[PDB]
Design a protein around this ligand. Sequence first.
Ligand SMILES: O=C(O)CC[N+](=O)[O-]
Ligand SMILES: O=C(O)CC[N+](=O)[O-]
Ligand SMILES: [Mg+2]
Ligand SMILES: [Mg+2]
Ligand SMILES: [Mg+2]
Ligand SMILES: [Mg+2]
Ligand SMILES: [Mg+2]
Ligand SMILES: [Mg+2]
Ligand SMILES: [Mg+2]
Ligand SMILES: [Mg+2]
Ligand SMILES: [Mg+2]
Lengths: 428, 428, 428, 428
Amino acid sequence: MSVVGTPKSAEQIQQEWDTNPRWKDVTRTYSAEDVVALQGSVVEEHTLARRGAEVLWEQLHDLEWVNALGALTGNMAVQQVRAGLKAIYLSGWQVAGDANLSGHTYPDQSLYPANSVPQVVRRINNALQRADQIAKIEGDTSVENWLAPIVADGEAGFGGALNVYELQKALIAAGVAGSHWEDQLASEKKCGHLGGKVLIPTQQHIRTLTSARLAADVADVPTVVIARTDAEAATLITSDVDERDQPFITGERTREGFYRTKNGIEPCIARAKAYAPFADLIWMETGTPDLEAARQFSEAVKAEYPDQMLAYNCSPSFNWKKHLDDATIAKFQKELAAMGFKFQFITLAGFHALNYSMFDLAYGYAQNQMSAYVELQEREFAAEERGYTATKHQREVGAGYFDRIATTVDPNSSTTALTGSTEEGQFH
Amino acid sequence: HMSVVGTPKSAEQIQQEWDTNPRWKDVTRTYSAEDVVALQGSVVEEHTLARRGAEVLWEQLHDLEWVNALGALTGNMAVQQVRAGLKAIYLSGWQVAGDANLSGHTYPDQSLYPANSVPQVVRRINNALQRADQIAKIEGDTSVENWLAPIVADGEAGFGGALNVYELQKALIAAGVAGSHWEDQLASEKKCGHLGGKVLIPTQQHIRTLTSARLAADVADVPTVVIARTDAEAATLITSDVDERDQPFITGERTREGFYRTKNGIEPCIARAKAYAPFADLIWMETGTPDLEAARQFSEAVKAEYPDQMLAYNCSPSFNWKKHLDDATIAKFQKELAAMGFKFQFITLAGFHALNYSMFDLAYGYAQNQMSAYVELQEREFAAEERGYTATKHQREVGAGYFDRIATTVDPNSSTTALTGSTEEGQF
Amino acid sequence: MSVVGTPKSAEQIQQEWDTNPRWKDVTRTYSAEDVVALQGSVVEEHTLARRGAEVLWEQLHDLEWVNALGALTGNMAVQQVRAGLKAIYLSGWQVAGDANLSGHTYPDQSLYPANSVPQVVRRINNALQRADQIAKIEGDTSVENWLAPIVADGEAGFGGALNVYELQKALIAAGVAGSHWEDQLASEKKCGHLGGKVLIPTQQHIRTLTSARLAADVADVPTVVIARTDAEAATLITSDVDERDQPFITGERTREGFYRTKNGIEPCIARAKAYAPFADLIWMETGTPDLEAARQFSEAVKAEYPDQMLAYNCSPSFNWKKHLDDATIAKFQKELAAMGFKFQFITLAGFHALNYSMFDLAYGYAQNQMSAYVELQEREFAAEERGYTATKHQREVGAGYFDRIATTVDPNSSTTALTGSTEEGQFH
Amino acid sequence: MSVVGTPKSAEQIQQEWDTNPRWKDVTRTYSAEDVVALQGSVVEEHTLARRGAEVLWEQLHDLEWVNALGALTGNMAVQQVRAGLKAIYLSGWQVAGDANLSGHTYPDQSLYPANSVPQVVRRINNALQRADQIAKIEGDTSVENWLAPIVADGEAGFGGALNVYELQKALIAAGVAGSHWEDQLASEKKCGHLGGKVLIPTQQHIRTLTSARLAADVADVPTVVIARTDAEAATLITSDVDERDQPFITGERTREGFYRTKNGIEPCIARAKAYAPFADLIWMETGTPDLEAARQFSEAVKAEYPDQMLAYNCSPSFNWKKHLDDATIAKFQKELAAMGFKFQFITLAGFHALNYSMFDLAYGYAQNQMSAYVELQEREFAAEERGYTATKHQREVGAGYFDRIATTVDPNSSTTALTGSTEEGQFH
Ligand SMILES: O=C(O)CC[N+](=O)[O-]
Ligand SMILES: O=C(O)CC[N+](=O)[O-]
Ligand SMILES: [Mg+2]
Ligand SMILES: [Mg+2]
Ligand SMILES: [Mg+2]
Ligand SMILES: [Mg+2]
Ligand SMILES: [Mg+2]
Ligand SMILES: [Mg+2]
Ligand SMILES: [Mg+2]
Ligand SMILES: [Mg+2]
Ligand SMILES: [Mg+2]
């Protein structure tokens, strides 16, 4: 029939694995023929997932470190990229709280439908693509790359290896660059800074990481795979079956059948070492923003895997000024970067920006009506000097871009949008 | 015997209600009570939040000096608006186009998105307010009297004909809308009222839309607030000279598409408003500037014919407010409008601007100073707590304590509850 | 503000539990006050969930037995009710294979998004409401109740007790009458007639049934709760914590940490007895359609709970003429009913009818083009004396109902649909 | 700083238009530079849309003709391909009746949300990809191309030119091979065989066809664009503005302001000639299945455009045996093919196959319970010699494929599906 999307041969895949420095430190317990066997007779190209993953991998090695903020709407990502950031973090917490396909507000317990984060990945990419389209017709060259790589939350996979596989495939279809996966029991999944966490055995999380890599391999894109461990605070594990976990099993049980396990940095290091062959970046949740604890984890892992890159959650679940002085806060990310934490992210930044800004506006509006909104509008005008463009909201969402479509189709159209608008007449 | 749940009322009951309930005092229906019953099948679904919200909205419009609101495009946004003291939520179609519609794309405000997008956001907002209400109950928080503030949502131009209007109204009601607004534009060329290129439809065709919106509410058995919007102040085009009420403004000239040129301004707005009044609970005229005198001229001309007719006013961010008004006039704007009979006033794009500006600000400072910039935000949140802000403790804000209560109701001995052991418990 | 939706008092709830015969055999390990504590300030009425649950309960005690077929589209349920069936079965298997929100074809392993079955419940209710509306304007009183009760698949809850709770809540909101829940590990869930099944402890499934009842109580509707056990074929269990499961543990462990367990009817009887206080109906998956095996199960359960109703899966996963003769097949369901199996269902009926009928049609179309389709249309014509109505496809999907809406809004509309249609012209 | 998805230059695009025979008869009223200006800086590859459209175009010139059946679920399309068909038809009618994103049953009047057909395109492709995957691991070479091209319904574009553009873009994103567009007023859209149809001016539909091509060009795929005219039966048109339409305007008006127009083959021929430069295939809706009327249309169009391919709706809205004898029915498609009708499709095949087969099954089940289902199962067994495979429903939906994923991830898994299943043991 056609040749579009013809799969590579197993030999080509193998050559890529054998010679591409992307795969230098990557262990795969399956073969290239196994990958090909699962690809059918046509492989869909995933342009944004490939481009994002390649850019992300190049950035993690060129930049001193890559940092990001949590984004839960498309407009949020656009502003993050407009303000200079070069990656986007897609928090599952934030999806649970304000952007998931159930319509409900949830705590961070894998309650929402498993295609929710992929939908937001696609949304963020759509929004960045629109900004990219608008910049082109506007001659705006101030942002080098609107298609910033997206690192998305795979939580605990929403089930078994096959649930992991499908979530990774959906993330890739939507244009993800990287995804992270934690060693928690999905049915009891928690945010890293909530209590009641239950670990799964070390080998079961290796299965998760293997499944996530397999899905990427089958989809033929070099997705960055991140392994997160929750062993610092978790005091429960599902089973003592894995000998790597037994040194921490205490013998105490729960009525659910769980096993108590000794928590802290020691089992995090062990698990991190075990995940390293399967992880492009390794991440340990911690209870406080502590540079020394971070350095201890960094050196224990790098003592065995010197080129292993790390990721660090700069969590709003910390009270920052309760633990650190301003001088430490200022240098915090820089100090982590020297330790090998090359991806650093404020997970819930979008939740807090969105809730605080609207509370502050609505509170003043309840008291002073228009005066309170004009304050915001004037702050927007004054922010144009810093590069802010969304004050002219019509062009920001593409009124001019769609006018260009309209006049490409019918140059004599008398129903274009921006001509005669208040934006053209009142905003300079 | 068959269950009697959902038994529809008799036409006599409906007619009795229309005749005696003061809610319907000034409401014309060109169809009969029997026509309504003919469309209801043999079971009528109860719409609790649509009924409650429509009832509360109507009471507030008659009890308060005026009802004001801000546009909300996420659930969390509406929660903060109600937390901050507002008593109604405005659901902007513009904002749904820009950052919250079911296509996943960023759109200008031209009816490009799928027609069930606004109903999904209505349902989302109600779900978010319900969660806030649930949390308040278990926390003993009586600081908000009514968490289920009424939602007024954008019906745009109906996404087609009378039947498309009917189905959108029905979907808004099913999601729990209190009120909905409908504008006299051609849906295939729909514009934001402050964009150019607008095309009116004939006066009688909008009466058909308003009639279809009422019919859908009657068939669904809820007293939804129906708002008529006219775009005749700026639109210089109309599809047809069919209606004799429109003909005095027709010039006779036509565009290459066959549209009729029409003389715009306050005069056709007054005429259309008078024609819409028997079919509208509120009437709203889009305007090119925020002008108290223009609003008064419109108000007096309408109330000369319909003295009890309530009005609505769009305090649009598409105006450059300090270009047109001084601070003193800005401070008194809404209060002066209320005295003229503008009982529902709303800042349409408040959510878009709060969201974009706050993330640009955060992301910009983050790009310069990393963690210092976010700590400024967290510290502002801490200080807002004396004004009633609660989202700094983000875990409880999204229901972690509510779901802990569910979990311990199911199994009081659960060892996997979330708030006990959280960093929120330990640090906030 | 308003009184619409005001919750009942705990005393009112308690009086219902104490005196409504619906609850005569129903254990609740939580209190009426616990329910009230979770309801916030407003309880949404769920008309179709309440009505359907009431009708299903009445039918189970009034009819000799209630039977159903699997339905995966709305039209499918319309034809089931048109042909005289009194209940709809909503198979999770069929949703996985051809009707879930990922858009993918899945085996029956809880791979699809957890709100998929709720959407199909809502869809089936919408389709039945449309048939009910059409019937009303057509004066068609040949079906007593178009709103037949829907029994839908809760699978293994897609996680822990909170995932169970949210799924039950979503099914209710969509209008479900009853829901079934199986004692399987969600992360390894299988169809009852697939291999590789893993049981969860008896107490864990009581937790699931408890959570399902709690969500119904909080939603204030009397949902029918069905317990399914997979212990007939499952040879694995997650844990030996529960002393009721220990008699069947062998001591062997898999590499995953699962416990090997002796499958058969004896564990199913024991689990059924344990589930009975928390289940309105009990169902054991079986490997073959066997009246004696079913009698053995029924007799042993009713020895302890004489009034316990049972449910039976007449599975297409069986090869019926391989096991049974024509005489036994003809009497199968009637015999089961005399044993207490009051709900009997053919799970994958819709998958097989849909797939076979299109293959048959398309195979002939490939060979003989239009002659193959005309054979079908003539069978449809022939079916009209048995009550089939869908040959006239325009009125079947509501063309006449929406014509009635259109002429209610505008009796003089020149754009109604059925007048001048080829249906009016060619189908007498 | 990546080259993935780099856009072509205008010169490359221009050379394609000048040298690829695909475009030899295609008029574009916009430039190649206009296309590039709208592409941003990254162009997403649409593998399935490209392959589908290339395969479709090749098939329309290689085969005697391409015929298809309407499909509304993924499994339906699988059985069509399994039975030997080489294209899929995606009916908007069927989507309105039983497969659209509102969840409601609708008549065919553009009532459903505009992203509904794109989702079904994606669903159909997903289902075919699964059949492809399964076939590969089963060594099944019985179907040469599982990814058969999909021809999908763009109705009247759901608004203006920009709504057209967005629908085409969304169809391509989902993998469509061709799309069709009709010269009706979107707000009054009807099935071609319903009454109350309203035409739009000839130039407005040229604009629609121009927008659909532009969206395909911007997405860089050779989508097949099909122009449908409803002028054979429509007696209304929105305007007299287009001199090409005026010969048929009678001067009579409707109260809405529409213009009566003389319907028949004459205006169809005239509109087809006007659409020819913009349409890869031209389709005239007709009131009866009439070979002579088809010939007149074909001959008059090809008199001016000899190479213009046509398309014909073998509609179930015709009562076939009322108009034609069996011999004419049998030769119908082959006769139309010789006249240049190279794409022929039975639009509502899936609705009638689905509805009749379930009525027939449920009627028998209502009377004879299991006996009626066993008849169907035996027919399925009997169809296996014709190539039917879905009797083994577990492997049909991919239980063997996901088993292969699972064993690729973990060869020692004790929780695979097919080992130990009743399909393995009873369906050998
Ligand atoms: O994010 C914030 O701190 C609020 C920004 N602002 O101007 O409202
Ligand atoms: O076998 C069936 O289900 C009926 C076949 N059919 O579609 O006419
Ligand atoms: Mg997370
Ligand atoms: Mg590594
Ligand atoms: Mg202030
Ligand atoms: Mg609007
Ligand atoms: Mg009025
Ligand atoms: Mg199931
Ligand atoms: Mg019981
Ligand atoms: Mg159609
Ligand atoms: Mg042509």
